[PDB]
Amino acid sequence: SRAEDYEVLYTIGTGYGRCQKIRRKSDGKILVWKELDYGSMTEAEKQMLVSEVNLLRELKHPNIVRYYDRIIDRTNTTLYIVMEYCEGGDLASVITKGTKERQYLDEEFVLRVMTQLTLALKECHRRSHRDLKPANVFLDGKQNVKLGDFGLFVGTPYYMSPEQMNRNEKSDIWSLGCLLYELCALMPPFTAFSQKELAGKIREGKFRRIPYRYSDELNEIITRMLNLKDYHRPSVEEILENPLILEHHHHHH
Ligand SMILES: C[C@@H](Oc1cc(-n2cnc3cc(OC4CCN(C)CC4)ccc32)ccc1C(N)=O)c1ccccc1C(F)(F)F
Ligand SMILES: [Cl-]
Ligand SMILES: [Cl-]
Numbered sequence: 001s002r003a004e005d006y007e008v009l010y011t012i013g014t015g016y017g018r019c020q021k022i023r024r025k026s027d028g029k030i031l032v033w034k035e036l037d038y039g040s041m042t043e044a045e046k047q048m049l050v051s052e053v054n055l056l057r058e059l060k061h062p063n064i065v066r067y068y069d070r071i072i073d074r075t076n077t078t079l080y081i082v083m084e085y086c087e088g089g090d091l092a093s094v095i096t097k098g099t100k101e102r103q104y105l106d107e108e109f110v111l112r113v114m115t116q117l118t119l120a121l122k123e124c125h126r127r128s129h130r131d132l133k134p135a136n137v138f139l140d141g142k143q144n145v146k147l148g149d150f151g152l153f154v155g156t157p158y159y160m161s162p163e164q165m166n167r168n169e170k171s172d173i174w175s176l177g178c179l180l181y182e183l184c185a186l187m188p189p190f191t192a193f194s195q196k197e198l199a200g201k202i203r204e205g206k207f208r209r210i211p212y213r214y215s216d217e218l219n220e221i222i223t224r225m226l227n228l229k230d231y232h233r234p235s236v237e238e239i240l241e242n243p244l245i246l247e248h249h250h251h252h253h
């Protein structure tokens, strides 16, 4: 694991540090890395970074962004985390694009996201947290969908579940429902200017139907994930049993 084993193509994001698209010298494989400067970190914080990286390395699944390697450049006090390159980028940018272009996404694409994220979620629960939010969902070059490592103040918590408003794997189902709803409608199911107003809308549990281009069957399952009672939301298993979900909606190598 050395930095010289890879060549940077270009930077794809800056924030935490920066994310760059890179090329593995030995075989030409295209990857990315997260570049983190740990020079200002205490031993404690550096220690919580080690454990974190250890947690990233323990989850291997087709619908979870894959970790490849960790590289320490103790000279520039930089740590690189090497991960898979997702050519389609993140889902938040896809929604924004639809919103700005005034173009809804195909039902087929929504089903692929539902199927593959529900499988990612199933694997997360099996192990036991990674945020179910558009910015943390990635698309590769083969129609596959993968959950990233985000989560694993200023903002409105659009996706918080009713039971989290005050006090559960069913809560993850609510968040997935919010995500799929936003993918369809291009806006979250509950919106407001403050968290208090938001909590008011969430408690009432009312929202618009997703657009009419989407089947009553898809509207139905998203609506069930958004039930106020956690025990009326479908489990991972009940979601995957839905007649909408077919083999082609799953991942393929
Ligand atoms: C911080 C970063 O986090 C992740 C990034 C990726 N990731 C892997 N391949 C990527 C390709 C991306 O877009 C490329 C350039 C622009 N075009 C339009 C699309 C291809 C964007 C993110 C990608 C995977 C996992 C994570 C993670 N934290 O788990 C991130 C997160 C959300 C949006 C943007 C970024 C980035 F910093 F990479 F830009
Ligand atoms: Cl529109
Ligand atoms: Cl209602």
Ligand SMILES: [Cl-]
Pocket: 188, 189, 190, 206, 207, 208
């Ligand atoms: Cl709404």
Ligand SMILES: [Cl-]
Pocket: 062, 144, 251, 252, 253
């Ligand atoms: Cl795959």
